[PDB]
Amino acid sequence: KEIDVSYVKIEEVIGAGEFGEVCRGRLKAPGKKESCVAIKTLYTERQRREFLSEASIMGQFEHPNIIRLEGVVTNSMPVMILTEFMENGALDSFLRLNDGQFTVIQLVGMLRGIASGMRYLAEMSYVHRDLAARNILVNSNLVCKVSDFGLSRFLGGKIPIRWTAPEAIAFRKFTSASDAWSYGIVMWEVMSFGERPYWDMSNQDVINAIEQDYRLPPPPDCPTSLHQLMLDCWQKDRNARPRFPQVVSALDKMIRNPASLKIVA
Numbered sequence: 001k002e003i004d005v006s007y008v009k010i011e012e013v014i015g016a017g018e019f020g021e022v023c024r025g026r027l028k029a030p031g032k033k034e035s036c037v038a039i040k041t042l043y044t045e046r047q048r049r050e051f052l053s054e055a056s057i058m059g060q061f062e063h064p065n066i067i068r069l070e071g072v073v074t075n076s077m078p079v080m081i082l083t084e085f086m087e088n089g090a091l092d093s094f095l096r097l098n099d100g101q102f103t104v105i106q107l108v109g110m111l112r113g114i115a116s117g118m119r120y121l122a123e124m125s126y127v128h129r130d131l132a133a134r135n136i137l138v139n140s141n142l143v144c145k146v147s148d149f150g151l152s153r154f155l156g157g158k159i160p161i162r163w164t165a166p167e168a169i170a171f172r173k174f175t176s177a178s179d180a181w182s183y184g185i186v187m188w189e190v191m192s193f194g195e196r197p198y199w200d201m202s203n204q205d206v207i208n209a210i211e212q213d214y215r216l217p218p219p220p221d222c223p224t225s226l227h228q229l230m231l232d233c234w235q236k237d238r239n240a241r242p243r244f245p246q247v248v249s250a251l252d253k254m255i256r257n258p259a260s261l262k263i264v265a
């Protein structure tokens with residue numbers, strides 16, 4: 001979806017990505033109402049192609065828990081990726097600002113949205129590789145959407161150790177099952193209102209700890225069923241981890257039986 005650059009007004013810089021700035025803007029194209037957009041702006045030709053691979057793959061997705069591509073600008077500089085705008089930004093920082101201010105049911109709803117997005121990606125054979133609360137964006141109604149897409153390999157970025165399943169660290173075998181590990185980490189982040197996973201450990205400490213059977217403890221006030229689901233995501237045997245359809249189904253059952261959520265350590 002090449003977009004005429006005259007249709008785009010950039011309004012403010014709102015963040016930084018791995019290739020450049022993130023801005024808020026407005027897109028108005030003939031036939032369509034004006035919408036608010038987020039804009040990544042961009043190097044070698046390989047880096048340009050890596051940058052744009054995000055748009056290539058995002059444009060192929062359509063799901064309420066996956067950020068929607070509006071278009072790209074490639075015929076002028078800077079080159080741009082334009083998406084729907086998520087007013088509340090990254091989930092880890094949104095939760096820190098809102099520490100202790102959402103109910104367990106609301107937090108489960110967020111996790112259910114993220115798990116539905118992942119179920120869709122897994123169904124499309126897309127392995128995310130960087131599933132982390134920082135890559136979940138949150139709109140005005142607490143709707144959570146998966147972001148940070150691309151087809152580049154890590155050295156691309158560096159493997160995100162704290163979020164990465166042990167077999168993906170050791171052997172670089174990334175699968176939807178290693179994403180399920182990362183999802184368990186995201187659950188822990190959400191229930192801890194955006195605490196850093198393993199905050200008191202270095203990357204190497206995390207690698208060594210997981211190998212020696214350490215798992216993150218239940219966050220304060222975290223329902224035991226939610227922590228058990230984390231522990232299930234963090235099974236060493238990747239084939240024993242629940243798949244995303246089972247994850248969504250587990251969360252939906254908790255939402256049906258909220259009394260279950262009152263059991264805490």
Ligand SMILES: CS(=O)(=O)c1cccc(Nc2nccc(Nc3cccc4[nH]ncc34)n2)c1
Pocket residue numbers: 014015022024038039040054067081082083084085086087088089090137147148149
């Ligand atoms: C208003 S605020 O200061 O709370 C704020 C800060 C940062 C981001 C957003 N929303 C926000 N909403 C949508 C997208 C986005 N960043 C991106 C733009 C283009 C491609 C992308 N891939 N992955 C992410 C991404 N960011 C909002």
Ligand SMILES: [Mg+2]
Pocket residue numbers: 128129130148149150
């Ligand atoms: Mg990534």
Ligand SMILES: [Mg+2]
Pocket residue numbers: 130148157
């Ligand atoms: Mg990333």
